């Protein structure tokens, strides 16, 4: 749940 917003991979740009 790194990244909130919609467009991550996994949960992040790096996650």
């Known amino acids: 749940g790194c990244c ?3 467009p ?3 949960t ?3 996650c």
């Open 4 to 6: 909130s917003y919609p």
């Open 8 to 10: 991550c991979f996994a």
């Open 12 to 14: 992040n740009p790096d």
